[PDB]
């Protein structure tokens, strides 16, 4: 067993252009458990991020929330960084507001 | 309706790192309340919802040492598979077990479960019956007849149909401000052009608990949940979850277009409408 | 409340 994570990228609230906010990067569906996130600001990782207590599904499968708090405007370009054993590379997920 | 609870836990060894990685959560429902992490630095059993914080001292104490013994059988279970499997020291290995109790509306007993699992597969699992098991292989047969030999089936079925669903119960009355409550979906919709013959209509579901729900869109009253890309029900991080469905539809039919949520917490289905 | 005994493997 070796599954890829998905991922998610989104605020706690509905965004907004000067609030102060929570930034969500879900990772789910993945196995084992050892994996790198990282949150990013215009391309930089975030420092003080927290995590979830890691769980899992009933097919066994990771998942694990990681957040910080943020006051985002019309762009403060966040995404977040994934590198799990299923990577060649980490890849990377911008948040998209709409979604 | 129907309640639960449930605890979680995962055993991950590192011949590099010493001594295993050991995770236990605790869940009734959608709510966790209690974690114990071995790479914090608490070393304890700790809360995790507020109506938890009403336990006493010798809660906490007693299982902070329960949870401790859980993970020393679960760092001996890691060594044991090794041999079980005829593997080596070198790699690392991983441990799941999930049990629990659900009860019905009238918070009577259910169901129980009792489930392990080794790098991912089913290892084995106590039946619905609370007095037999199902050994996914060759060496889980071994642990059946074990556990057979020692009542654990029945020292589980007294645990999952007693202990269990009476501090289910416990929980509930003591978090009934909050783990009674049933949050229902705030619903928006979105319009977005792809092409001038195109268009992405998107329902939103937000701030909702607890976190079963379905999502549909419907052309003309018919499915299109084939056609739908409907993204995994995920947390806000503040104890409620969200979800959106989304579908691709040609510009001037916008209006042929519902979107249909169902939820706990609803009293009937809505439909929302472009 | 946790299962006060765990058996091992």
Known sequence: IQRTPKIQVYS?????????????????????????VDLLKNGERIEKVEHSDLSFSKDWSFYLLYYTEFTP??????????????????????????? | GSHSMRYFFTSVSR??????????????????????????????????????????????????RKVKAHSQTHRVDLGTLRGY?????????????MYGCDVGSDWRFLRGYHQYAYDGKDYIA????????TAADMAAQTTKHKW?????????????????????????????????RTDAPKTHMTHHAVSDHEATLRCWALSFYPAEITLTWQRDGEDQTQDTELVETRPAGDGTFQK?????????????????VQHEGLPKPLTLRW | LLLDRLNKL
């Open chain 2, 15 to 64: 011949p590099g790192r010493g001594e295993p990685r050991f995770i236990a959560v605790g869940y009734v429902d959608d709510t966790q309340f209690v974690r114990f992490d071995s790479d914090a630095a608490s070393q304890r059993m700790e809360p995790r919802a507020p109506w938890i914080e009403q336990e006493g001292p010798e809660y906490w104490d007693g299982e902070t």
């Open chain 2, 126 to 133: 106590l039946k619905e019956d609370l007095r037999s098991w």
């Open chain 2, 148 to 180: 057979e030999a020692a009542h654990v089936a029945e020292q589980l079925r007294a645990y999952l149909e007693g202990t269990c669903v009476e501090w289910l119960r416990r929980y509930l009355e003591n978090g009934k401000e909050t783990l009674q």
């Open chain 2, 244 to 260: 959106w469905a989304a579908v691709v539809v040609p510009s001037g039919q916008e209006q042929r277009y519902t979107c249909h």
């Open chain 1, 73 to 99: 405007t019309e762009k403060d370009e966040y995404a977040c960084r994934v590198n799990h054993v299923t990577l060649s590379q980490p890849k990377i997920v911008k948040w998209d507001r709409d979604m």
């Open chain 1, 12 to 36: 706690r609230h509905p965004a907004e252009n000067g609030k102060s906010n929570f930034l969500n990067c879900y990772v789910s569906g993945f196995h084992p458990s050892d994996i790198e």
């Open chain 2, 85 to 97: 499997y005829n593997q080596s020291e070198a790699g690392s290995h991983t441990v799941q077990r």
